[PDB]
């Protein structure tokens, strides 16, 4: 079954029927979702630059620690050498003090030998 539909300058159209039928958001909603996505992108970026900043702080803490280690190694060396040098000085001066005192005690004895000679 044919049924004519339309004719025109550059064509015509019709319909052929064989069997009949067996059976008779908003602009603000849009930009709301895009601004939310943009603020998730910027928040993840904030987090990344925060962790990178935390790594910058760690790096300058490592460099500071190496400086402090070197200054504590100088300070330990300095006070241990001072303690050593002054301990040697007190010991060597004591040996000499003792040696001189023994010699001077002998000189006391020799004057006593002399005076004892004058009694006889």
């Amino acid at each position: 079954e044919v049924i004519e539909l339309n004719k025109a300058t550059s064509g015509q159209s019709w319909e052929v029927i064989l069997k009949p039928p067996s059976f008779d958001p908003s602009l603000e909603e849009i930009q709301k979702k895009l601004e939310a996505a943009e603020e998730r992108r910027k928040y993840q970026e904030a987090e990344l630059l925060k962790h990178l900043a935390e790594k910058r702080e760690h790096e300058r803490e490592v460099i500071q620690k190496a400086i402090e280690e070197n200054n504590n190694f100088i300070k330990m060396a300095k006070e241990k050498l001072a303690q050593k040098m002054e301990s040697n000085k007190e010991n060597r001066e004591a040996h000499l003090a003792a040696m001189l005192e023994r010699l001077q005690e002998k000189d006391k004895h020799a004057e006593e030998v002399r005076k004892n000679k004058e009694l006889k």
Binding site: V2, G11, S13, W14, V16, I17, K19, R40
Partner: protein, 426 residues
């Protein structure tokens, strides 16, 4: 006067646009400089005070490479520079990048140019939109554009021509994702979308044109022949599909089920006897000539139109139509009449000179809304599920500001569509 506006998004849409507008200029006798030595062509071409004809088209890409070849190419003078819009950095195959990151930066500009073309219209019908499912711009930006066009032109039709990805034609790992995502976002905004399967087109180029490895030029010229058949109704004073609204009336009885299957015949190799109205006709029901790979006899029909072109006499058509009824068992759903709308458009089919197609005295393109096209969705859905069960690549999308929830929502919509097709073909 019934003006239409073409939008070409991303690489695939720009290069199919190139091929169509080339054919349109050949079909209407417009030279590449826009000069021109039936006035229905004015639906697609405006006219300047210098006598030149300018396509009612906007080309959009987030990257300059492809459109720069338009700016410097053979038809460079046909388009005004305003109609060609590029960013500097593409979407890197990432829907959420084209939709949320870059798309937010360039959309108002694109809408401004569209607003301007629409102002040169005394009766705008609406928009034809060209894009790939797979690219980041073609999926991500296109779906943002459709959202906005619905807001700004509510009572206006939008027809999509969408490239469906294929591993044989330079596809990427993440294209199932992009495909499902843009299909979710644009479903409620498109009134009629013609899918083009790159594998189907590639198969047709190989078998009928004898090109072992087709180029993009090859696929896009064959695609333009199909697009031309569908729009010839609008560009010439035809009788079937005279306005964008008629596509919905004739092919889309149910809104979500708006994906018709195109079939074209004949594709004859230029390198290699004229075929009757009856031979090109029964070649409309051979799956080899489908634009999308599916088996329409494992489905049911809701609508069917035959767009003839060239020297086709109505009695031949009815003679062919009666023969295939007895020869072929094709099934319509219960609540639809079993039959066809027929259009003859007297303009001969035109081939690009020197191209790989051969000039023929007659040709036909069949548009059907069949449930069989669901199995193209099933194929994409399955590749989506494989990757999404392991969350593979999802982190690229979350990093652009998309929420992982959008993946499951989109995939639930595709499920609903798959069972929409199930239900109407019960």
């Amino acid at each position: 006067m019934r003006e239409c506006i073409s939008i070409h998004v991303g690489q695939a849409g720009v290069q199919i646009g190139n091929a169509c507008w080339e054919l349109y200029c050949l079909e209407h006798g417009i030279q590449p400089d826009g000069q021109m030595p039936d006035d229905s062509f004015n639906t697609f071409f405006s006219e300047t005070g210098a006598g030149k004809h300018v396509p009612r088209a906007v080309f959009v890409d987030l990257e300059p490479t492809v459109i720069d070849e338009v700016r410097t190419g053979t038809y460079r003078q046909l388009f005004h520079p305003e109609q060609l819009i590029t960013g500097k950095e593409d979407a890197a195959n990432n829907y959420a990048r084209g939709h949320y990151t870059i798309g937010k930066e360039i959309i108002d500009l694109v809408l401004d140019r569209i607003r301007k073309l629409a102002d040169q219209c005394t009766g705008l019908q609406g928009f034809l939109v060209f894009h790939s499912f797979g690219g980041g711009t073609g999926s991500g930006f296109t779906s943002l554009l459709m959202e906005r066009l619905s807001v700004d032109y509510g009572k206006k039709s939008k027809l999509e021509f969408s490239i469906y990805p294929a591993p044989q034609v330079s596809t990427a790992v993440v294209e199932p994702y992009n495909s499902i995502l843009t299909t979710h976002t644009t479903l409620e905004h498109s009134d009629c979308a013609f899918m083009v399967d790159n594998e189907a087109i590639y198969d047709i180029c190989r078998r009928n044109l004898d090109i072992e490895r087709p180029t993009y030029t090859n696929l896009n010229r064959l695609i333009s022949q199909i697009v031309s058949s569908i729009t010839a109704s609008l560009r010439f004073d035809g009788a079937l599909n005279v306005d964008l609204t008629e596509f919905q009336t004739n092919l889309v009885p149910y809104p979500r089920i708006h994906f018709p299957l195109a079939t074209y015949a004949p594709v004859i190799s230029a390198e290699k006897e004229q075929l009757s109205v009856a031979e090109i006709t029964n070649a409309c029901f051979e799956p080899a000539n489908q634009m999308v790979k599916c088996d329409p006899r494992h489905g049911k029909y809701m609508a069917c139109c035959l767009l003839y072109r060239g020297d086709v006499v109505p009695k031949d058509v009815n003679a062919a139509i009666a023969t295939i009824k007895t020869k072929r068992s094709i099934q319509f759903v219960d609540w639809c009449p079993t039959g066809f709308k027929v259009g003859i458009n007297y303009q001969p089919p035109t081939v690009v000179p020197g191209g790989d197609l051969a000039k023929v005295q007659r040709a036909v393109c069949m548009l059907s809304n069949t449930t069989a096209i669901a199995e193209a969705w099933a194929r994409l859905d399955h590749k989506f599920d494989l990757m999404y069960a392991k969350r593979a690549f999802v982190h690229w999308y979350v990093g652009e500001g998309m929420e992982e929830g959008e993946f499951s929502e989109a995939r639930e919509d595709m499920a609903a569509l798959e069972k929409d097709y199930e239900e109407v073909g019960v």
